[PDB]
Amino acid sequence: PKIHYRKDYKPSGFIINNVTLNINIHDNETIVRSVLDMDISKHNVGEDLVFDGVGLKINEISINNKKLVEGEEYTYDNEFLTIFSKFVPKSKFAFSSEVIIHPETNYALTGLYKSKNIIVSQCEATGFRRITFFIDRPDMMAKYDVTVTADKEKYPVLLSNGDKVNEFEIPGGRHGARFNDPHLKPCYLFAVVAGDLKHLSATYITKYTKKKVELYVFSEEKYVSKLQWALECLKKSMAFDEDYFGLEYDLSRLNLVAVSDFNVGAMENKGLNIFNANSLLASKKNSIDFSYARILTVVGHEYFHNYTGNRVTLRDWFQLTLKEGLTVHRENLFSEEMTKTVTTRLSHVDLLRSVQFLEDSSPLSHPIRPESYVSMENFYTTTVYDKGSEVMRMYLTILGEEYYKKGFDIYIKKNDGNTATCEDFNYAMEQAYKMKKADNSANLNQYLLWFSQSGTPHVSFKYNYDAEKKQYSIHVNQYTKPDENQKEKKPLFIPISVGLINPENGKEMISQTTLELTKESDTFVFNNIAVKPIPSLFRGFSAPVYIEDNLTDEERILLLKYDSDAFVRYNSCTNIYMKQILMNYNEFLKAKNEKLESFNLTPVNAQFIDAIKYLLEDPHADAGFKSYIVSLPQDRYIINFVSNLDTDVLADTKEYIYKQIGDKLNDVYYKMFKSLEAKADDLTYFNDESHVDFDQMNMRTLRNTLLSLLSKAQYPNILNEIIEHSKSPYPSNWLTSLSVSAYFDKYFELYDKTYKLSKDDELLLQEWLKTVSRSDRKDIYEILKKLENEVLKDSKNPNDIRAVYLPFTNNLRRFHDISGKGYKLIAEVITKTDKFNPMVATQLCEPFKLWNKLDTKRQELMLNEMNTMLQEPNISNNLKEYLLRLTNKL
Ligand SMILES: Cc1ccccc1NC(=O)N[C@H](CC(C)C)C(=O)NO
Ligand SMILES: [Mg+2]
Ligand SMILES: [Mg+2]
Numbered sequence: 107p108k109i110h111y112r113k114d115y116k117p118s119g120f121i122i123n124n125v126t127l128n129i130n131i132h133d134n135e136t137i138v139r140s141v142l143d144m145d146i147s148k149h150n151v152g153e154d155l156v157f158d159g160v161g162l163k164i165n166e167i168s169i170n171n172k173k174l175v176e177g178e179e180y181t182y183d184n185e186f187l188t189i190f191s192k193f194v195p196k197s198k199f200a201f202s203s204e205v206i207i208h209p210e211t212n213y214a215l216t217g218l219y220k221s222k223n224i225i226v227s228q229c230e231a232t233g234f235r236r237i238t239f240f241i242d243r244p245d246m247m248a249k250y251d252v253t254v255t256a257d258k259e260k261y262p263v264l265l266s267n268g269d270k271v272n273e274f275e276i277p278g279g280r281h282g283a284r285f286n287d288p289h290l291k292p293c294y295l296f297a298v299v300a301g302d303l304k305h306l307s308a309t310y311i312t313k314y315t316k317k318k319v320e321l322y323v324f325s326e327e328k329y330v331s332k333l334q335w336a337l338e339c340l341k342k343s344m345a346f347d348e349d350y351f352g353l354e355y356d357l358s359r360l361n362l363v364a365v366s367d368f369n370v371g372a373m374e375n376k377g378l379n380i381f382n383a384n385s386l387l388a389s390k391k392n393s394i395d396f397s398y399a400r401i402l403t404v405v406g407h408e409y410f411h412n413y414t415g416n417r418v419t420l421r422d423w424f425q426l427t428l429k430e431g432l433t434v435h436r437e438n439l440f441s442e443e444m445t446k447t448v449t450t451r452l453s454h455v456d457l458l459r460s461v462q463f464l465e466d467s468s469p470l471s472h473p474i475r476p477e478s479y480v481s482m483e484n485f486y487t488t489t490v491y492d493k494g495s496e497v498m499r500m501y502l503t504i505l506g507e508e509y510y511k512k513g514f515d516i517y518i519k520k521n522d523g524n525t526a527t528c529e530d531f532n533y534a535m536e537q538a539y540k541m542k543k544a545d546n547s548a549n550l551n552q553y554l555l556w557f558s559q560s561g562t563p564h565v566s567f568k569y570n571y572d573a574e575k576k577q578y579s580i581h582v583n584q585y586t587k588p589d590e591n592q593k594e595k596k597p598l599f600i601p602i603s604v605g606l607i608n609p610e611n612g613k614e615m616i617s618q619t620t621l622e623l624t625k626e627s628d629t630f631v632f633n634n635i636a637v638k639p640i641p642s643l644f645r646g647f648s649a650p651v652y653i654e655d656n657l658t659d660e661e662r663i664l665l666l667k668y669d670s671d672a673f674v675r676y677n678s679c680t681n682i683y684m685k686q687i688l689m690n691y692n693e694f695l696k697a698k699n700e701k702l703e704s705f706n707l708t709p710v711n712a713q714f715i716d717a718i719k720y721l722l723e724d725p726h727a728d729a730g731f732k733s734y735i736v737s738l739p740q741d742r743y744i745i746n747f748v749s750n751l752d753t754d755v756l757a758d759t760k761e762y763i764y765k766q767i768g769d770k771l772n773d774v775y776y777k778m779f780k781s782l783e784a785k786a787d788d789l790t791y792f793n794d795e796s797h798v799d800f801d802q803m804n805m806r807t808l809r810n811t812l813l814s815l816l817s818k819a820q821y822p823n824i825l826n827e828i829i830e831h832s833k834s835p836y837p838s839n840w841l842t843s844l845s846v847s848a849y850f851d852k853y854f855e856l857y858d859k860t861y862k863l864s865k866d867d868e869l870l871l872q873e874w875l876k877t878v879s880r881s882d883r884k885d886i887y888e889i890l891k892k893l894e895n896e897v898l899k900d901s902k903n904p905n906d907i908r909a910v911y912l913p914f915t916n917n918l919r920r921f922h923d924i925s926g927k928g929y930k931l932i933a934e935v936i937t938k939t940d941k942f943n944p945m946v947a948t949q950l951c952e953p954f955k956l957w958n959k960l961d962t963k964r965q966e967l968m969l970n971e972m973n974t975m976l977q978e979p980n981i982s983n984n985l986k987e988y989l990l991r992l993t994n995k996l
């Protein structure tokens with residue numbers, strides 16, 4: 107396979123200054139005429155001029171109006187257009203091509219494609235080359251003049267990046283519109299849309315310069331009623347970037363557009379952000395609660411890219427984390443501000459420590475700045491995004507807000523209108539660090555190891571208290587396991603936010619402080635510590651690491667009850683659960699492997715259970731927080747701690763723990779489920795798509811979590827509650843009713859009731875699919891076949907395929923059926939999907955990432971299906987690279 111290496115970056119021998127496009131859409135073809143105003147750079151050595159261009163049908167090629175001919179002046183192999191150097195001019199020249207493409211048959215959803223009745227593009231990362239010829243790499247920055255033409259009745263709204271400078275009629279019922287985007291950009295930010303779209307709009311006035319900006323949000327007509335919250339979220343995002351970062355929008359208009367068929371969440375094309383409809387559209391009668399947070403985060407994310415990605419872009423794709431890590435960090439700061447709920451930060455931590463930690467202990471492990479790739483599209487990973495965001499957040503922790511803002515402004519201004527690298531960011535942050543330390547010899551050179559070193563550090567602690575001296579020490583060690591990327595791992599710069607809690611009264615003993623660990627080990631000593639404390643470590647999850655607190659369960663309970671920091675309280679609970687899970691898992695495993703007739707199980711700590719009850723009964727404690735403490739850690743977190751994991755033993759472990767706790771708490775759970783109803787399900791704001799009460803949402807989450815627990819338990823007469831819950835106006839509630847009814851004979855009645863409620867809204871039907879797929883049913887395989895035959899059928903919509911299959915792959919007992927039948931079903935889907943959408947097929951591989959963590963029979967089953975997939979003729983490069991890497995062949 108063809109391998110790109112970070113070290114081999116070199117600037118191009120060519121420059122593309124202007125791009126003038128005419129995109130003429132017809133029913134059975136799209137013609138793209140393109141003039142590139144080009145020149146030779148200072149790096150040119152008289153090389154052949156080689157353009158990327160994939161799957162293009164050439165009508166004509168010329169340079170300075172001289173037609174070039176195949177075999178004589180150029181070659182084209184359906185991937186690269188090579189213009190022989192004799193025919194490449196030595197100063198400014200005009201390159202002209204006209205090609206034919208077919209959006210109507212583009213089911214890969216990259217390049218120019220049709221999504222229902224909308225024509226849309228997706229160019230990041232390598233899609234622009236499927237539209238026209240280009241030197242398709244992000245350092246080739248140019249200005250764009252785009253004309254779109256189409257049939258007027260079918261495609262009345264025509265959009266491209268930037269200012270609409272003309273609109274015109276064309277004979278034969280056609281029309282055109284011309285766009286000028288004044289801002290230099292890489293081709294990955296080009297976009298066009300053509301459709302019968304409806305809109306909402308508003309005018310936004312910028313905070314500092316008072317620029318009037320016209321904000322438009324677009325969808326198909328059926329769903330125009332679902333646009334308002336996105337528009338509100340865009341206004342919020344703009345105000346946030348003004349308020350925190352001092353950054354104003356830079357065009358007279360910003361359009362956001364929803365499309366039904368989209369490979370991921372959304373895309374930041376300049377002035378023309380394009381979204382999966384599931385990440386832009388909601389209404390309170392037709393969407394679950396989680397849609398609202400999802401739209402907030404995705405609108406925010408694309409908006410924040412306007413500076414971190416667009417106004418400052420990437421030198422090369424190895425720098426991906428510089429825009430994605432940084433933008434996710436911005437998106438998270440925004441989300442935390444807008445929701446004002448502690449569960450927001452906790453959700454980010456949960457995502458990292460489950461999926462990203464698994465990735466980082468897998469054969470796919472990479473640093474946030476990879477050293478090589480075959481398909482760049484396989485490095486849009488939770489590592490690059492979520493670990494990257496934690497790396498970007500650690501700068502804020504280290505510097506504090508004021509000096510963080512100073513550093514960020516150095517970066518964004520210095521590199522405006524240009525490309526940048528991860529080093530440029532580190533350099534800006536290092537200038538701020540020098541200022542903060544008031545020491546021009548302070549440096550962040552060690553910090554760069556967070557970009558280059560793969561794997562998750564493990565940080566462990568030992569404590570000592572000297573009562574006579576009132577002096578406390580925290581001894582800290584860090585270790586990162588060697589891997590395929592580095593045989594020797596170096597210590598990182600790890601910021602450890604800490605507090606100290608007095609166990610006798612629950613109060614804070616020090617001003618919070620941030621320990622700067624830079625060696626493999628260090629001892630931090632505190633004076634004037636009046637009694638032996640319990641330490642509150644890694645507050646806010648201050649570095650992306652495995653934490654070994656070396657606390658007793660009694661100490662963890664005291665932090666859970668009394669500490670101030672939500673992450674520490676949550677992590678203390680997580681740790682109590684993990685100790686229990688690992689102990690019961692080992693008990694069950696030994697019993698199974700030794701074929702014992704009788705054995706013991708370690709009970710769940712009774713004082714921990716008492717602590718859960720105390721928290722749940724505190725009417726002044728946070729409902730979202732409560733929902734985190736009654737839930738065991740996710741399976742993808744637990745697996746990071748077990749080698750040769752037997753999934754059936756784990757399922758039995760989790761069931762035992764849950765049942766131990768419910769046997770004590772179910773009456774508490776029931777009382778709370780009823781008491782919370784009035785506030786949870788109050789209809790304030792039910793008609794207001796500009797305002798969400800995230801606290802009330804967390805109350806519904808808690809009710810729905812409790813209802814699940816009580817349903818699994820078969821708590822007496824709970825079916826009555828489930829049936830009432832199905833009548834609630836909130837989709838979060840009535841879909842919960844279907845999930846929790848899995849444990850009762852009423853499940854198929856609720857399956858039909860909820861289907862009827864869901865079937866007339868595309869996105870609600872997809873949420874219904876997910877609810878069915880995740881249902882804890884012994885007959886889940888027969889239900890999946892029913893979904894395939896009755897609902898999914900031949901759909902090529904990635905949201906339908908993902909909705910049917912992904913939730914089911916998280917069913918620990920059933921997906922990992924020891925027959926292998928789960929692995930086989932998903933591998934058949936992956937292979938089917940790969941023949942038309944390789945990016946989605948690779949997404950569907952997710953469950954296999956943990957293969958080498960399983961017991962050896964399951965490892966063998968998964969490996970056999972991965973190798974079967976690899977044998978498939980015409981396997982995509984995306985899938986083949988992914989699977990070769992995952993199975994330790996690449
Ligand atoms: C792909 C992915 C990987 C990891 C985490 C989140 C995403 N989702 C996107 O929507 N990503 C888009 C990618 C774009 C190339 C379509 C993104 O970052 N939008 O700004
Ligand atoms: Mg083609
Ligand atoms: Mg996000």
Ligand SMILES: [Mg+2]
Nearest residue numbers: 366868901903
């Ligand atoms: Mg559809």
Ligand SMILES: [Zn+2]
Nearest residue numbers: 407411430433
């Ligand atoms: Zn992004």
